[PDB]
Amino acid sequence: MSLRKLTEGDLDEISSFLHNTISDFILKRVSAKEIVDIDITVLVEYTDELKVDISAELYLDELSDADPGIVDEAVDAAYRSLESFLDGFRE
């Protein structure tokens, strides 16, 4: 481990990195202009043990047509990119 004392700042740098990771993954899956909107909430908590919880919603136009997992791929890509980003600190 080679980081800082995890408080609101560090935890939001991670919440923002996770939000961008899903957003950029959604943009490498389907266009921001085929999308009506996206709703992404990243939660991180510490109660003797560490919790990280990622909720993402992807709202396409009533005309678009995309893959039956394209959102789940973004959240999984964020969780697995977090697990390997943490391999840089926890192995």
Side-chain angles (χ1 to χ4, degrees):
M1 61 182 178
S2 180
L3 65 141
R4 296 295 73 196
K5 271 69 179 295
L6 293 178
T7 189
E8 297 171 283
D10 320 72
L11 293 180
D12 271 320
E13 284 180 288
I14 291 173
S15 95
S16 185
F17 175 66
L18 290 170
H19 172 216
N20 243 99
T21 300
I22 302 181
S23 187
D24 293 308
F25 192 102
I26 284 176
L27 268 55
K28 94 195 294 183
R29 255 57 275 283
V30 64
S31 182
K33 202 171 292 183
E34 297 171 294
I35 288 173
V36 163
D37 219 330
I38 52 176
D39 280 282
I40 290 162
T41 308
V42 180
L43 306 93
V44 56
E45 193 180 87
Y46 200 102
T47 164
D48 198 63
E49 60 174 78
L50 201 172
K51 212 62 48 182
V52 182
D53 307 278
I54 305 184
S55 185
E57 266 281 56
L58 174 278
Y59 300 136
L60 280 167
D61 189 27
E62 291 278 61
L63 181 149
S64 302
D65 185 29
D67 305 77
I70 211 166
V71 206
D72 192 62
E73 287 175 47
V75 210
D76 166 57
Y79 284 119
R80 291 195 284 142
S81 188
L82 191 282
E83 286 171 277
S84 186
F85 175 65
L86 241 68
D87 86 51
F89 296 130
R90 280 55 165 85
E91 202 177 302

